[PDB]
Design a protein around this ligand. Structure first.
Ligand SMILES: Cc1cc(C)c(S(=O)(=O)Nc2ccc3c(c2)ncn3Cc2ccccc2)c(C)c1
Ligand SMILES: Cc1cc(C)c(S(=O)(=O)Nc2ccc3c(c2)ncn3Cc2ccccc2)c(C)c1
Lengths: 273, 273
């Protein structure tokens, strides 16, 4: 609508990249693992697992249904039973994220070193933003095509920052264009560890944020959307904080129960030695 | 109680064999398959599958639970999805049945040719009799330890002869001793195909039936148990008929979708050529 030509083409490129690289039905997610058929650090692991307490459902192509109810925490390794499957899901999402960045002209024009630093910095955030678009806030369920992930037991759930983020972001009822602009702004973060072209990346980020702000002003006159751009920017700031918290959760769990795939090791800085 | 010494020792041997060879909790049933993640003969296959329309539940050692809801009949091969797992279950039960016969002195004293003919004749019947002792008639569920098999959809279910048999036999509220005597009588059937020692087997059967009849008269005075011995004998006659019906169902399904394990092939006469 009422944007500059540069702004409209910028949204069209982002929407084009999202359409090409986001398997919204998860049809190509296959071959994943499923759950099978000194102690002050350990209770920290119970805390480090809170955002992933889900049951799992598989609807088969034939119409069959498999449900998995996880074990209760009985003090043993059984809290790790879903981690292999989660690693396969996240890895699959991360490939989508990487493909998304590679399609964007503004991203492929950066030096490959900064491309790698930016993806290392933002992969978790873009993953969570994509998961929010399949999140059902009425049933607390991420609806991933034939897979469903439903939160286990009520409002003590919203004490987990990750889960409060998904419910709050869902409440804003964003358009597809606003989600993919959130992804652009998070991807082009000039202050990630190891970025060299600080100013180029920072100017790109500002252009994406200006586009987002202008999109909202032109297509959202309603008083419910007053300050909407500022709410989004505050959520992106919270999400970067959640990203730092969860990066540390992963490294702690990896330290005592290895599970990260090779791609997760690259993205989160695990060298293998 | 009030039986001869020969009769009491006969029950003690049968109970001893049952105790040694019947894994009532199914703890040693492992490594089984699970469902994955010209046309007048085909609708006969829908009929030939009626007694096995169950959903499946696995309680894990860790406290996790897996449930499988089968597909709806949509005209394709998806009605066969549970057959590999059923073959593994039946094979496992059949090994129990074979071990049971081998412990019994009266059985190991027959010529090995008649042993084989008797087991070929009775394996399905002894399997169904053992399954009845874990059948829950209130929920229509065979409760096999950590596995559960629950009948899919009400009283149209009791039109299936197998399922009417399990409900009716459960209603008689038999003791363990009466079940294992039912197994003896069915095992020692003088008129199975290929039995040579007709009279020896027939006299053994009569002794088992006399023992059963005397056990009921001595330990069951209540009017609800009037004619109980005759009800049991009528059920064993019905079960032999169900056995012949289901032997033909298996051979028909095997003919167009092979699934029988090697042990099932031996027991049901499939040569492999
Ligand atoms: C310990 C640990 C730390 C990290 C940091 C990760 S992860 O980035 O590789 N992926 C990831 C993916 C989804 C998540 C999530 C983390 N937390 C909450 N959901 C929400 C949800 C849950 C189920 C399905 C869909 C979405 C993993 C995998 C493990
Ligand atoms: C086509 C076909 C024909 C035959 C003849 C068999 S089977 O004898 O090898 N075993 C078998 C075992 C149990 C059954 C059952 C048959 N029918 C009803 N239940 C009841 C039940 C169902 C689930 C769990 C426990 C008990 C098989 C396997 C397939």
């Amino acid at each position: 609508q009422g944007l500059t030509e540069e702004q409209r083409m910028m949204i069209r490129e982002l929407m084009d990249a999202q359409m090409k690289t986001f398997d919204t039905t998860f049809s190509h997610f296959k071959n994943f693992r499923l759950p099978g058929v000194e102690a002050a650090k350990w209770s920290q692991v119970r805390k480090d697992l809170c955002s992933l307490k889900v049951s799992l459902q598989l609807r088969g192509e034939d119409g069959s249904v498999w449900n998995y109810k996880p074990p209760a925490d009985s003090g043993g390794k059984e809290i790790f039973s879903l981690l292999p499957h989660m690693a396969d899901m996240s890895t699959y999402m991360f490939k989508g994220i990487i493909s998304f960045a590679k399609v964007i002209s503004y991203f492929r024009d950066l030096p490959i070193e900064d491309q790698i630093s930016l993806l290392k910095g933002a992969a978790f955030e873009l993953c969570q933003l994509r998961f929010n678009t399949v999140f059902n806030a009425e049933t607390g369920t991420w609806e991933c095509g034939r897979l469903s992930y439903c939160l286990e037991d009520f409002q003590q759930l919203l004490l987990e920052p990750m889960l409060k983020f998904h419910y709050m972001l869902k409440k804003l009822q964003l358009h597809e264009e606003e989600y993919v602009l959130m992804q652009a702004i998070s991807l082009f973060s000039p202050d990630r560890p190891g970025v060299l072209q600080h100013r180029v990346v920072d100017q790109l980020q500002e252009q994406f944020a200006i586009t987002l702000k202008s999109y909202i002003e032109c297509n959202r006159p309603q008083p419910a959307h007053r300050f909407l751009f500022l709410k989004i920017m505050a959520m992106l700031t919270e999400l970067r904080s959640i990203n730092a918290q969860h990066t540390q959760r992963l490294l702690r769990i990896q330290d005592i129960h290895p599970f990260a795939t090779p791609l997760m090791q690259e993205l989160f800085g695990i060298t293998g030695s």
